[PDB]
Design an enzyme around this catalytic site. Structure first.
Site, mmCIF file in Angstrom:
data_model
loop_
_atom_site.group_PDB
_atom_site.id
_atom_site.type_symbol
_atom_site.label_atom_id
_atom_site.label_comp_id
_atom_site.label_asym_id
_atom_site.label_seq_id
_atom_site.Cartn_x
_atom_site.Cartn_y
_atom_site.Cartn_z
ATOM 1 N N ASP A 12 0.886 -1.194 0.000
ATOM 2 C CA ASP A 12 0.000 0.000 0.000
ATOM 3 C C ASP A 12 0.913 1.230 0.000
ATOM 4 O O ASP A 12 1.542 1.529 1.052
ATOM 5 C CB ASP A 12 -1.010 -0.081 1.146
ATOM 6 C CG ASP A 12 -1.931 1.120 1.207
ATOM 7 O OD1 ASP A 12 -1.530 2.182 0.648
ATOM 8 O OD2 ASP A 12 -3.040 0.998 1.834
ATOM 9 N N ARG A 15 -0.331 4.296 2.236
ATOM 10 C CA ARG A 15 -0.044 3.962 3.640
ATOM 11 C C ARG A 15 1.440 4.115 3.909
ATOM 12 O O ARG A 15 1.793 4.863 4.830
ATOM 13 C CB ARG A 15 -0.483 2.533 3.970
ATOM 14 C CG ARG A 15 0.125 1.984 5.254
ATOM 15 C CD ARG A 15 0.087 0.476 5.237
ATOM 16 N NE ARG A 15 0.388 -0.044 6.549
ATOM 17 C CZ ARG A 15 1.601 -0.341 6.989
ATOM 18 N NH1 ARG A 15 2.672 -0.254 6.202
ATOM 19 N NH2 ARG A 15 1.731 -0.775 8.220
ATOM 20 N N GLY A 39 3.308 -2.875 17.482
ATOM 21 C CA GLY A 39 2.919 -3.752 16.363
ATOM 22 C C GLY A 39 3.771 -3.461 15.145
ATOM 23 O O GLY A 39 3.220 -3.127 14.100
ATOM 24 N N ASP A 61 6.014 -6.682 18.708
ATOM 25 C CA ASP A 61 4.956 -7.423 17.983
ATOM 26 C C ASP A 61 4.735 -8.769 18.679
ATOM 27 O O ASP A 61 5.736 -9.439 19.013
ATOM 28 C CB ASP A 61 5.309 -7.609 16.510
ATOM 29 C CG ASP A 61 4.085 -7.844 15.641
ATOM 30 O OD1 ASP A 61 3.490 -8.947 15.746
ATOM 31 O OD2 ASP A 61 3.700 -6.904 14.903
ATOM 32 N N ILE A 89 2.199 -5.692 23.758
ATOM 33 C CA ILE A 89 2.702 -4.412 24.326
ATOM 34 C C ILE A 89 2.214 -4.314 25.779
ATOM 35 O O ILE A 89 2.848 -3.615 26.573
ATOM 36 C CB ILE A 89 2.248 -3.212 23.467
ATOM 37 C CG1 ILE A 89 2.904 -1.913 23.940
ATOM 38 C CG2 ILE A 89 0.730 -3.097 23.428
ATOM 39 C CD1 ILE A 89 4.411 -1.966 23.917
ATOM 40 N N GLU A 90 1.112 -4.995 26.091
ATOM 41 C CA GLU A 90 0.430 -4.931 27.398
ATOM 42 C C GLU A 90 1.236 -5.729 28.431
ATOM 43 O O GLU A 90 1.105 -5.407 29.612
ATOM 44 C CB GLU A 90 -1.009 -5.435 27.255
ATOM 45 C CG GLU A 90 -1.925 -4.465 26.524
ATOM 46 C CD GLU A 90 -2.092 -4.676 25.023
ATOM 47 O OE1 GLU A 90 -3.053 -4.106 24.455
ATOM 48 O OE2 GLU A 90 -1.263 -5.395 24.415
ATOM 49 N N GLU A 105 1.015 1.803 13.101
ATOM 50 C CA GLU A 105 -0.089 1.668 12.120
ATOM 51 C C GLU A 105 -1.134 0.718 12.723
ATOM 52 O O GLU A 105 -0.946 -0.494 12.662
ATOM 53 C CB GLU A 105 0.484 1.223 10.779
ATOM 54 C CG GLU A 105 -0.469 1.457 9.625
ATOM 55 C CD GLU A 105 -1.508 0.370 9.488
ATOM 56 O OE1 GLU A 105 -2.467 0.331 10.319
ATOM 57 O OE2 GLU A 105 -1.357 -0.438 8.569
ATOM 58 N N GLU A 114 -11.294 -4.222 14.285
ATOM 59 C CA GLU A 114 -10.085 -5.040 14.555
ATOM 60 C C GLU A 114 -8.887 -4.098 14.505
ATOM 61 O O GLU A 114 -7.869 -4.424 13.880
ATOM 62 C CB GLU A 114 -9.997 -6.212 13.568
ATOM 63 C CG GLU A 114 -10.961 -7.350 13.883
ATOM 64 C CD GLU A 114 -10.749 -8.637 13.088
ATOM 65 O OE1 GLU A 114 -9.586 -9.016 12.883
ATOM 66 O OE2 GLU A 114 -11.755 -9.262 12.673
ATOM 67 N N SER A 119 -4.363 -0.915 22.292
ATOM 68 C CA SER A 119 -2.970 -1.314 22.608
ATOM 69 C C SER A 119 -2.058 -0.079 22.551
ATOM 70 O O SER A 119 -1.153 0.045 23.408
ATOM 71 C CB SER A 119 -2.502 -2.410 21.680
ATOM 72 O OG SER A 119 -3.181 -3.631 21.936
ATOM 73 N N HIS A 255 -5.532 -0.305 0.865
ATOM 74 C CA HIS A 255 -5.965 -1.661 1.280
ATOM 75 C C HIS A 255 -7.154 -1.555 2.246
ATOM 76 O O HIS A 255 -7.867 -2.536 2.394
ATOM 77 C CB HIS A 255 -4.781 -2.424 1.867
ATOM 78 C CG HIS A 255 -4.475 -2.107 3.292
ATOM 79 N ND1 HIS A 255 -3.801 -0.945 3.677
ATOM 80 C CD2 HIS A 255 -4.704 -2.813 4.423
ATOM 81 C CE1 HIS A 255 -3.635 -0.951 4.984
ATOM 82 N NE2 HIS A 255 -4.186 -2.094 5.479
HETATM 83 N N1 DVS Z 1 -3.831 -1.910 8.221
HETATM 84 C C1 DVS Z 1 -4.183 -2.497 9.314
HETATM 85 N N2 DVS Z 1 -3.559 -2.313 10.477
HETATM 86 C C2 DVS Z 1 -4.194 -2.602 11.755
HETATM 87 C C3 DVS Z 1 -3.325 -3.453 12.639
HETATM 88 C C4 DVS Z 1 -3.058 -4.825 12.054
HETATM 89 S S1 DVS Z 1 -2.072 -5.863 13.175
HETATM 90 C C5 DVS Z 1 -0.393 -5.299 12.808
HETATM 91 C C6 DVS Z 1 0.647 -5.969 13.687
HETATM 92 O O1 DVS Z 1 0.383 -5.624 15.071
HETATM 93 C C7 DVS Z 1 0.602 -6.778 15.869
HETATM 94 N N3 DVS Z 1 -0.152 -6.639 17.114
HETATM 95 C C8 DVS Z 1 -1.514 -6.559 17.244
HETATM 96 N N4 DVS Z 1 -1.926 -6.371 18.476
HETATM 97 C C9 DVS Z 1 -0.751 -6.334 19.213
HETATM 98 C C10 DVS Z 1 -0.499 -6.167 20.591
HETATM 99 N N5 DVS Z 1 -1.445 -5.906 21.497
HETATM 100 N N6 DVS Z 1 0.789 -6.222 21.005
HETATM 101 C C11 DVS Z 1 1.752 -6.416 20.095
HETATM 102 N N7 DVS Z 1 1.634 -6.558 18.769
HETATM 103 C C12 DVS Z 1 0.352 -6.507 18.388
HETATM 104 C C13 DVS Z 1 0.193 -7.966 14.998
HETATM 105 O O2 DVS Z 1 0.892 -9.149 15.373
HETATM 106 C C14 DVS Z 1 0.642 -7.510 13.595
HETATM 107 O O3 DVS Z 1 1.934 -7.998 13.242
HETATM 108 N N8 DVS Z 1 -5.225 -3.383 9.264
HETATM 109 C C15 DVS Z 1 -6.018 -3.614 8.068
HETATM 110 C C16 DVS Z 1 -5.527 -4.757 7.211
HETATM 111 C C17 DVS Z 1 -4.210 -5.193 7.275
HETATM 112 C C18 DVS Z 1 -3.743 -6.170 6.401
HETATM 113 C C19 DVS Z 1 -4.585 -6.732 5.474
HETATM 114 C C20 DVS Z 1 -5.904 -6.318 5.408
HETATM 115 C C21 DVS Z 1 -6.371 -5.338 6.269
#
Ligand code: DVS
Ligand code: DVS
Lengths: 303, 303
Positions: A12, A15, A39, A61, A89-90, A105, A114, A119, A255
């Site tokens: 993207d 983005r 993340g 992550d 992160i928590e 992001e 979602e 976090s 995306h």
């Molecule tokens: N663009 C986004 N973006 C939103 C975040 C996606 S998760 C992006 C990353 O964050 C990590 N994560 C999530 N909650 C977490 C936590 N509490 N503590 C540590 N790491 C954490 C997860 O493993 C992932 O690698 N979403 C839409 C999307 C993404 C890809 C494909 C389709 C749609």
């Protein structure tokens, strides 16, 4: 999690190049600072911060992807600046008390589906130094009215005659499901209406559950078949070079695409009419969107 | 499960109209017969059989979708002919000992990924009357050689330079993942090679795990970057009007698309060369495909 998510996000250009531009064009925000990437995924944001002159970058992550980030940080010889930690992160223990800057992001479809903001707000409240900054710092959500009787028929009327058989009863399962898709801008029949403004510096988790009255200024006499939602992302605080991108239909697709709420009963609208409705978002992982419009109410979720 | 799966299958005109044509154009297979629809979903196949003159149709589905099928059968006033039962075909109690005819749409990506054939073969062995018939009765799997250095670069080379940073180590997670996508027929550089033939009348579960030596007759001097897999479905036994459809790239696209196995090392091939390789399928829910070609072996799975 799976590499496929990270491929889609990295490909993207809106983005990833918005984050790159904000960081490279505002290195004073990063020079000799301690940065937390919440993340981090493959760690690209941590590597941007490093290149803009961060003293130290902590990439966190919870997923397997962090092991790929460890190899990537080594491949780019940034292991002396970027330290990576697996966990929520928590839960993780950081080798510092406080950070100067948080980047993430965190944004989901329609901003909050979602999403990771909960976090990121936790990181803010626990780790962000007095007078520190979080980025992106400002977000907005908008609604816009849609006329597209063909796409509506493709999804709804479809079920009335399926190779000669009635499947009408299927409509009640379909209407409540929000659709993530790219809208033809030609199908928009109102000015957009902001329904939500967030500063990540001052917002709490409780503010992400909200209601807003809205008015759509109708710009075309047409059958209104849907309401579309999107969000705008801003990098503003302390920037000489401010950065915005929109996930709206008038802008280059992302995306995130747009989130479309189909009407059970499309209804005619007039150019210059002020269409009044109400929307409420409940965190009811999974969140719901209740829309009142034209004396009808429907609650939508996302699959 | 979710309506979205059933929408995608119902909107596949090749899939659904092939079943409709086979049934309506061969009503002698259905007239006054007892029919079992294994994984009936919305029940469209059961309603086709009913219309072609089935005495009795038993539609079985383990998912919620069966409750939507109950409403659909009532909406079409077929409840006197079609009886629907929730459960695994492996567990449910049928109000008969034996059926005359089994119909099912059981086929997965590359025929066997997350396929239902094991459930259909169980139905055959337990419930199919002496001299009865199962449909579709004949299936084939084919491989075809591909040249597409641009799509290969989009997926593999991509990871060498990501906004100025090396992510090369990501290639080892990507290569082993088979891709389900529509191939441009212009990118095919061999004649297809059959690697598997199945008659559902005689095949066992054990025959679905197999090895085949194959030869691809190269039709274009090019860089070979991938092997594509697809399947053909035939309705033959006792038909005056036989029906075939192909999910191959030369044919109208289906929701099965094609399954593409990317080569780590693309290699040059000559028009008129006989390219020799080996493939083995293991049920290792989730199944794997081991390809030997040009003195290299890779095992592929599907996400
Ligand atoms: N663009 C986004 N973006 C939103 C975040 C996606 S998760 C992006 C990353 O964050 C990590 N994560 C999530 N909650 C977490 C936590 N509490 N503590 C540590 N790491 C954490 C997860 O493993 C992932 O690698 N979403 C839409 C999307 C993404 C890809 C494909 C389709 C749609
Ligand atoms: N075209 C297909 N087609 C393969 C079968 C899909 S499942 C099709 C239906 O069969 C049901 N089912 C599965 N195992 C069953 C069992 N043991 N006993 C009873 N009912 C069973 C399942 O609830 C579903 O409604 N797959 C590819 C595909 C489909 C939709 C979208 C993308 C790809």
């Amino acid at each position: 999690g799976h590499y496929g998510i990270h491929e889609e996000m990295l490909k993207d250009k809106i983005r990833t190049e918005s984050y790159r531009d904000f960081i490279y064009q505002n290195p004073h925000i990063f020079k000799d600072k301690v940065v937390l990437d919440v993340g981090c995924g493959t760690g690209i944001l941590s590597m941007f911060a490093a290149k803009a002159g961060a003293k130290k970058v902590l990439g966190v992550d919870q997923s397997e992807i962090l092991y790929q980030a460890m190899d990537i940080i080594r491949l780019n010889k940034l292991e002396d600046t970027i330290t990576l930690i697996k966990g929520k992160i928590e839960e993780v223990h950081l080798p510092v008390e406080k950070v100067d800057v948080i980047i993430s992001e965190w944004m989901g479809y329609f901003l909050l589906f979602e999403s990771m903001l909960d976090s990121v707000l936790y990181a803010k409240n626990k780790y962000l130094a007095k007078g520190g900054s979080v980025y992106p710092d400002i977000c907005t959500i908008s609604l816009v009215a849609v006329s597209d009787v063909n796409k509506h028929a493709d999804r709804i009327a479809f079920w009335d005659d399926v190779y000669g058989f009635k499947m009408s009863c299927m409509k009640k399962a379909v209407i409540p499901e929000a659709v993530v898709e790219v809208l033809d801008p030609k199908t928009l029949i109102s000015e957009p209406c902001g329904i939500k403004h967030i500063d990540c510096h001052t917002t709490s988790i409780s503010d992400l559950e909200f209601s807003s009255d809205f008015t759509l200024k109708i710009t075309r006499t047409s059958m209104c078949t849907a309401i579309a939602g999107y969000f705008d992302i801003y990098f503003e605080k302390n920037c000489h070079n401010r950065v915005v991108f929109s996930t709206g239909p008038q802008s280059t697709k992302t995306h995130w695409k747009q989130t479309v709420f189909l009407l059970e009963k499309p209804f005619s609208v007039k150019a210059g009419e002020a269409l009044k409705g109400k929307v409420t978002v409940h965190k009811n992982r999974s969140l719901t969107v209740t829309l009142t419009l034209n004396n009808s109410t429907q609650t939508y979720g996302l699959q």
